[PDB]
Structure formats: C-alpha cells, structure tokens
RNA sequence: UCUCGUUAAGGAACUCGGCAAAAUGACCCCGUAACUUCGGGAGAAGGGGUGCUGACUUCGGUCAGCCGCAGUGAAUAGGCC
RNA sequence: GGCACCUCGAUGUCGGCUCGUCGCAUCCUGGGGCUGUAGUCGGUCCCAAGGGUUGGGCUGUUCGCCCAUUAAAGCGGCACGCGAGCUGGGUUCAGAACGUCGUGAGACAGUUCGGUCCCUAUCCGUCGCGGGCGUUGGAAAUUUGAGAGGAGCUGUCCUUAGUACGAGAGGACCGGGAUGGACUUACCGCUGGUGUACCAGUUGUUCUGCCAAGGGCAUUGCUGGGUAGCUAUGUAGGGAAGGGAUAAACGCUGAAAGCAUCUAAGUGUGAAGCCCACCUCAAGAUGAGAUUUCCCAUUUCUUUAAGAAAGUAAGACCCCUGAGAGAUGAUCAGGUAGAUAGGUUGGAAGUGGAAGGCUAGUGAUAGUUGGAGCGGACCAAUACUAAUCGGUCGAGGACUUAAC
C-alpha cells in the first residue's frame, strides 16, 4: 500500500535521502504498489555531493514495504519502513552500495544486479 | 410538501380498511368452563394446568 | 467443530516443543533457489500466537542491520524442518506488540532458568 | 450430469503435496434416493428428482409419504431436479454416493446467499458518500433521481430494499478430497450460504 | 441479550431485581426483565452450592449489599443479610435438583401501558 | 439524521480556503536568534525529570532498591515557525 | 444574433458534488477499400454505439496552459440534466476603501475585504414487502418458459523467428502459451479492523464496622489484549470456447449487350455489432400451463337450480419456545411421537498466574502450592424450567359435442 504523495526512503549510496512518489506505472489508473513494483519519484532531500540532487525526476523500485508480501507457502514478511533503490531503465542501479535487508520477491523480476549487493536477502 | 387536494369520501375508507382490531386465542378454562387466554393464568379461577397457583 | 477435527488430524505435526511468547527461537526454514533446496536460519523473539487448532500461528521479531523484520509461519508446515527453544524470558503479556518502539538496550527481557 | 446436494459445515485449511496452504470448505453429504424419473413422452423433458436429508415421521403428511413410498425411504426434506443428465443409466430408488466426484476438479456450486435485512443504498451498490465536512449536509444518500424533461422517474434507479436471500452460482472450482467413509467433499475457495444451508454441486458447464 | 437502558443502568437494575426474589421467592414484573432475571438468578445460585471462600467472594458482588431479613428470635434479634440467606437456606435446599429452578407465569397486562406482566417463583 | 468512541497502509492527494476534527496543555531544571522606540521579541525555538520502599534528611535533596507497555497514570490546563 | 407568443397573486443564475441516460458527424479496441503502402510505421475514406475513456499544480471558474501516465484521455442533447438531493465560493442587497466621473447628494460589466438558502410527502413515479380474490372439487410438492434484467473492457512478456522484409538501417502477418490493470459476484479458514453483560494493570474519592478482599463515580475513568457477529486494504472465481443470419468489402457461374460483367433468375465468404450460447426473475402468460401423491357423501325443501344450511376427511391456521430469518407482517427450526430456547455437567477461543496459606526479605515486593483463576454470542452431552390444556377454518365436484 504505497500511493501518490507518499514518502519512501533511499536505501542506496546514490546521494538522495527522501523521496515522494508521483505515479505507480503499469495499469490505467492503479492506486497502490507493493514490494518489487516500479515507481516514478522526485528527490526531496539530498546529501551534499552525489550524482543525485533535488528536483530530479527519477525512476525507483520498491524494496521492503511496511506491509510485505505473502509467501505462496503461507508465511509473510512485514518490515518497519519503506525504501527504494534508484534505477536506470535497465534494472541497473545508480548507487554502488545497498543498506538494509531486501525481500526475496526481486529474484522473480530480473533485479539480479541488486540482490548480489543486498547484505541480507530475506 | 403539502396535500394538493382533499381526499374523497371513498379513498378515506379504501385506505382505512386495514385499520382493525382483532382479538385472538380464547380458550375454555377447565375448572369453571369460562373463557381464558391460552398459555395464561385464569384470572377468575386462579388455577393453571389444573392446579392452584395464586395463593398465600 | 468435531466433524472437522476428524478431518484434520493426519496433518498435525507432533514434535513442536513448548514455547510461550517471549522465548528466543531458532527456526530452520526451507528455501528454494533454482533447482536446489537450501536451509535459511531465521532466529528472533516469539511475539504472537493465534490459538486455532490446525492453523495456530506465531511470529518472530529479528533486527538485522538496524531494520526490524518479522515473519509468521503456520504451526504445522511441512516446509519448516525444525524449531528449537533457546531461552526463557520473564514476560507478563500474551501479545508483545509494545516492542516495535523500543531499541537495543531497552528491549531486553530477563532470563529464566526454567 | 454428476449432481449431489448436501449441507455446509464450515471452512478450514489443507496442505497439498508441495507445502502450499489452501483454503477449503466442507460440503457434507449423505446418501440420497432418486425419487422420480421424468421422461419426454410424459413430462416433456428428462430429469431426475433427488433428496438430501431425513425428516422424522411426525413432520410429514400423507401426500409426502405416498409420493416417497414408491421407493421405500423415510420422507425427505429437500427435493430438486437435474437436466442434461444422460438419463438411461438410472432407476427409481437408486442412490448417489459421493463417489461421482473423485477428482472432478471443475464444478459449479450454487446455493442461497446470506440475509442482511433492510439496507441502505451504499451497502448494496458501492455508491460513494458525499463530502462529510466542509459544511456539507449530504453524507449518505442515493444521489439524484434523474433529469427533468421526462416528468417521471426512469426504471432501474437503485435505492434501499432487502439485501441478500437469492441464489447464485460460482464456476470453475477444484476438488481436493472425497472421504466416502464419511461422505464429505472438499473444494477450493469460498462457497455461498449460511451454515447448515442447502447446497448443490454439478459438473462444469464451460467444459 | 436484551438491552433496556445504557450499560451500567441495566447492570444496576438486575443487581436490584435479583436481590428481591432472594428475599421473597416471588416477584411480579414485566416479561423481558423476567427472562433476563431468571438467567441471572439461576447463575447466582450455583455459587450457593460451593460455599467456600471463593464462591462467597464472587457472589458478594452481585447482591445488594445489605438487606436485612429477620423472622427469627430465640431470645435475641438474629439478622440475616440476604446473602447469608443465599448460603444458609437456598443452598442446602437444591443439592439434588440440578439446573433450572424458576417458574414463569404469564398473567395479564397492566392498566397504563399494556405491558404483559408475569410472575417468578422458585420450586 | 443528530450527539459520541475506535481503525490497517498512506498523511493535505479533499477543498474556493487544513472550515471541521487530530495534535500541544501542569510543576521543576537547562537553554534561547534576527530585529528595537532598548522597555521588549520570550512561555520564542529546542530539550530533560515526576511513581513506590528504605537509608541519610545539615536545609533543600542526595543514595540504594522494587514494579508496570505507560508513574502531574483519571478531569481541569498554549500548537509552532 | 432577430422577434417579443410564454411565465411579474414571485417559473432561482455559473462552476463543483452524488446519479445517470441518449444521438454518432467515432477517441481506443473490431471488419474493410486506395496509397506517392518494401518492413515496422502511416495518410484518407467506408461499416460499426458493445464496452471504455486518469491522477495533480494555477484561477470563482468554466475555457485554458503545464507535470506525470495510458489502448485512448471523443464531440453533443436531456430547463447550456440534476439546489422540495448538497455547496453558495462566484455575479446582483444594507458596512468600508482605492482609481476615475460629477460643483453636489451619488455613480462605474473597474477593483479589494465581510455578509441569514424555509418545508412533518396527499396524488402519480421509482425501490422492497404483505393482505384479498381469481385460475370452475378440496389439498401437499416438483417443474416448462411467452417474456424481462444482468454481463460484454483491455495490456505486457515468451515462442513461432532474428525468419519473410530490407543495401543497410531496422523488423512482421497469421498461431500457441504465461501473467497483469480496472470492474465485479460470494465468503471469514489466513493478514488486519471493530467488538460498552470477556480477561488483566493503574489514579482519585466514597461506600460494605476495621486490616485483607470488593462495589459505586469520573467520556466504557484511562491504558494493554480480544470470542462469536459484521467486515476490506484479505481470500476464491468471472467476461472461456462455439453456432446461425447480416453490414462495408471480395467473389463463382451467367445474360439483356455473340464480348466484358458479383445479379435480374441461381450460389457462397464475411465484424467487439443482431439472434442463441453464460447468470438471474418469471403462469395475475385473466391464452391464468404440466406432472407425482392424498382425501370420497347429512337435513328440510327454495323447488330440484351451477338451491340453502349444519357436522367432517386430507390439510391449514390461531396460541407458545426461537433464528440460519427479521422495521411490522413474511421465511425457516420446534412445540412431550420433544434437544426449540433457558438452565446444569464437560470442552474450546481468550486473557495470562485466582483467593487463602507458606518461605525469603526491615520494606517496597519476589518464589511456591498451580498453564492457575475467570470465561457474552462458540462445540458437545442431559428433560431440571418452559413449548399444558385447547380452539377456528376447511369438498361432496355445471353444460354441449365427438370419440370410444
Ligand atoms: Zn379458570
């Protein structure tokens, strides 16, 4: 459940800290978005330096929502925060380091170049 | 809103037909043969189920 | 109620030990990658219990790299190999929801040698 | 063709052979005697009467016990028909156990919905309230009734009136088990009806 | 259940009615209060069958605190506080009778509201 | 329809306008900018402590220990830039 | 824009909200002809109204400019739809001010701040639900379907195939498969919400003679959990595959016109559209349908007629215990040939360690007796209480003609 006007967090070493969504690409009027769905957002806060700054339009992906997916077996995951990791239209991140665990549901979406950097893949 | 006409004499009745007052469930008591209400204590006899109840 | 129980006995695992909310519990899960079968190890604090019979459940609260995580499993799965209590903690509630706002040196539960 | 009535006990879960929980309801049944065979030359079509439960004896009357006793059973509670069934193949007073649905895997349960009494115009159609603040006074009503030109109200404007209590069928559900020793089926998903209601199960229509 | 007022008012009304009908063994009220009070009274007489502390200290919250009942004297004034009655007289009078010890009798409506009245007894 | 109580995830996307609701609110302690008619702004902002038992109380309080998810444990009692 | 027939014993304006509906001069999806159509794209014209047609920033806004998506972000009618359904911001009251005009009192489709929107549904209309009678003997059940309603949307990926195509550049038709968006039908086993006669902690003050134990009041006193029930953001499924007759278009065969030519006679293909296919209502369908089973005859005469009256069969109702139902009535489960409700004995969800004792401590408190005590709707078992005794209604089956 993450929709317009909501604030993610950057879980990357790219230069951005917060973020505010814009759209939920995929569909003709979708409302929400869950783990592993792409997104359009524009930086709000930023650290000095970095390749990313305020007022930039960027695409990101949703890692570790605060009401996580269901496992087909019958288990669930429910983190404490929300987070995103910036992307270059080829599922390839911009930053070069990732903090905080990531849920497994990415391996099913060719987001490999991410999982190989996550410290924990739950 | 507010009526647009007086109701005729007929419509008055034709609507009041379902305004009745029916009494139902009248039984013959068993100690004095008088009419009493089923499942209810007999007021004059005082009895019920062939037994006395209202006593002190 | 009685007609269902008779329909749901053959699938009640029967080696689950005793553990009440507030006992650190190591969980040998089952993972699936490619054409393999690894075994993860999720290991936290028992928080919850939904008393239900065939479908009782429980939850565990880990903290990895400063980000809380929780998983809940059905009590009678075939895709969990083993469970093993590790400790026993003094606790007076049956639902320890009040932990998600506590960190580190404030969310420790005293041990009990029983 | 394959048709069986039965009760409705409740819902529980079941693991399959690959570690996958599955919601499952418990349609219970009992044997049931075919009561009458309607033919073309007599009744204009072909169908089969069935009945799934047993009354006491106090709770019937001579027509019922004279209409059943041509098959020698205790008088039944429910009586229904079935069509498109290959007639043949049958007799007055046979039985229909739960065998016929071994792993049919495609089935169309029907039944009677729940009951919800007089209801508003939002719990029946998903009509949306009006702004609950900013000074409005239009919280929870059914909107307007149409235009002015026609000097009447078009048909099929929807507003309050009893919700629920009419039959409905679902299609293309699977079947999980058949415990003939207790006459119980187990299907996947949600099935309509109140507990202890009356349910019917036939083979799929969409092949 | 059947509400009649707010919560606490109903609770007080029942804690009232079942404290009579302990002292008189008979009561003439309406129909609904009758049903709820038969439930409550029968539920507060099994406590008269244990007689220990815990049953005492659990019954001692659903009974009007102090309502004397004095028909006795040898050379004295013996007072019975309508709970001591519960644990001295009603109790030992029901040892073999199992649940269900009240009779309800539908008599006649009332003058001003036509509320069909009713009686309640014990045997 | 009116008068009240509670809510997952999101937190002004509603709307003419955050109207309405929500949030702060007591006592003690630390600390507090531009600006100025030098009096003020100032309760600016932003923070910390409060329960019970024993000991010592110089006097105020300090030490030690105990329990709860929460210690002006209920009602009364500034939202800020 | 014109006219001034219409309404001055009062016919209320723009936008936005809830709710729709209809036309097609069509925005997307569907079928086609031509191309200055190699392919992928495209341009135009034709047939076609089945469904679908977004969130936000700025102004009172219609209009419009912009950002981000999408298959697409259509144009119009319905008092420029809808105020006895909502708002009243806007333009049109009384206050006040600026610029300009007037000598003045005042004025300005110039501007700025503030400002009272009443109504208990009689008739028709729409949404649901009963009573009366009819259907030609009285009753219990099961169905046919003349008709009506619902439903109709679509993307992306993979393979066919790096093929046909093309110098390269780039890159398919027709098929097969997986998975989504919106919309929508049912349900509570999972995740969550609620849960005021369930369990625990804790403040004040007052009451039960006191300590211990408890009640009353303070938004349910406040806080932490939470059963049944009702629930969506949760779960499961749905628009699948086909047939018949047609639209634009394309033919086959064939002449009037020794040829050519789809047409007049003959004979075909062809679309999300028409009619079936899928789901529901339905014999008040007064053209009142069909089938299985059940019950079979007193008194006088009005005068024997489709006569009147009385007692019954089958059955139904009244009355009472209730809920899987419920505004009332109705539907359903039962009424001693009994588990319908209450109660009682077990059990479960749920809280989370009762009271009284004992041990350790100066004391707060802690340990043990003990997964304890309590336990509204839930699951079993038992006639202890209550469904007693009773009462009312309810047929005796017309005629004509043919056949047998
Ligand atoms: Zn009598």
XYZ file of C-alpha atoms in Angstrom, chain E:
123
model
C -29.187 -10.396 25.385
C -31.722 -7.578 25.680
C -30.710 -4.010 26.458
C -33.130 -1.686 28.220
C -31.024 1.388 29.033
C -27.336 2.174 28.962
C -24.897 -0.395 30.264
C -24.464 0.461 33.913
C -28.164 1.156 34.390
C -29.061 -2.344 33.236
C -26.399 -3.810 35.486
C -27.848 -1.964 38.453
C -31.410 -2.932 37.570
C -30.507 -6.607 37.519
C -28.446 -6.362 40.680
C -31.666 -4.943 42.097
C -34.215 -7.452 40.857
C -32.235 -10.486 41.735
C -31.873 -9.278 45.271
C -35.526 -9.347 45.752
C -36.707 -12.784 44.646
C -33.975 -13.889 47.011
C -35.878 -12.431 49.930
C -39.476 -13.104 48.901
C -39.184 -16.053 46.476
C -41.752 -14.259 44.315
C -41.948 -11.195 42.125
C -44.428 -9.580 39.746
C -42.851 -7.611 36.901
C -42.890 -7.465 33.111
C -41.915 -10.074 30.535
C -38.384 -9.168 29.421
C -36.929 -8.361 32.831
C -38.349 -11.748 33.754
C -36.265 -13.637 31.211
C -33.040 -11.839 31.961
C -33.558 -12.215 35.673
C -34.251 -15.940 35.531
C -30.947 -16.349 33.744
C -29.119 -14.238 36.316
C -30.720 -15.796 39.408
C -30.048 -19.332 38.316
C -26.493 -18.320 37.545
C -26.155 -16.887 41.065
C -27.422 -19.966 42.879
C -24.738 -22.401 41.777
C -22.451 -20.212 43.850
C -24.678 -21.170 46.730
C -23.599 -24.745 46.100
C -19.864 -24.404 46.636
C -19.993 -22.384 49.847
C -16.248 -21.860 50.190
C -14.430 -18.538 50.243
C -14.066 -18.030 46.521
C -17.733 -18.628 45.828
C -18.596 -16.318 48.719
C -16.281 -13.539 47.457
C -17.586 -13.921 43.975
C -21.259 -13.876 44.902
C -20.652 -10.896 47.130
C -20.598 -8.522 44.172
C -23.945 -9.328 42.518
C -26.153 -8.765 45.556
C -27.442 -5.519 47.045
C -25.025 -5.029 49.890
C -27.168 -5.228 53.000
C -30.880 -6.004 53.050
C -31.997 -7.480 56.355
C -34.324 -10.477 56.574
C -35.440 -11.051 60.173
C -38.112 -13.559 61.054
C -36.327 -15.250 63.939
C -35.608 -14.807 67.650
C -34.993 -17.262 70.482
C -34.058 -14.644 72.962
C -32.218 -12.303 70.629
C -32.511 -10.366 67.381
C -30.952 -12.549 64.688
C -30.397 -10.709 61.398
C -29.901 -12.343 58.004
C -28.364 -10.184 55.300
C -29.919 -11.807 52.241
C -26.574 -13.242 51.238
C -26.124 -15.304 54.357
C -29.583 -16.437 53.350
C -28.212 -17.477 49.977
C -25.548 -19.569 51.679
C -27.685 -20.896 54.523
C -31.165 -21.633 53.213
C -31.459 -21.692 49.434
C -28.196 -23.583 49.003
C -28.829 -26.694 51.064
C -32.300 -26.724 49.538
C -31.158 -27.562 45.993
C -28.460 -30.203 46.394
C -30.228 -32.854 44.315
C -32.159 -30.614 41.946
C -29.818 -29.814 39.086
C -30.071 -26.712 36.916
C -33.308 -24.901 36.127
C -35.110 -23.787 39.284
C -37.578 -21.000 38.365
C -41.159 -20.859 37.080
C -42.537 -18.020 34.944
C -46.284 -17.410 34.727
C -47.945 -15.172 32.144
C -50.845 -13.441 33.885
C -52.266 -10.242 32.440
C -51.321 -6.816 31.023
C -51.299 -3.624 33.035
C -53.567 -0.608 33.149
C -51.451 2.167 31.724
C -49.105 0.607 29.178
C -50.335 -2.899 28.309
C -47.047 -4.468 29.269
C -47.852 -8.171 29.685
C -46.841 -8.869 33.259
C -45.540 -12.106 34.744
C -44.643 -13.880 37.994
C -41.491 -15.701 39.079
C -41.204 -18.484 41.625
C -38.582 -20.903 42.863
C -39.748 -24.501 43.117
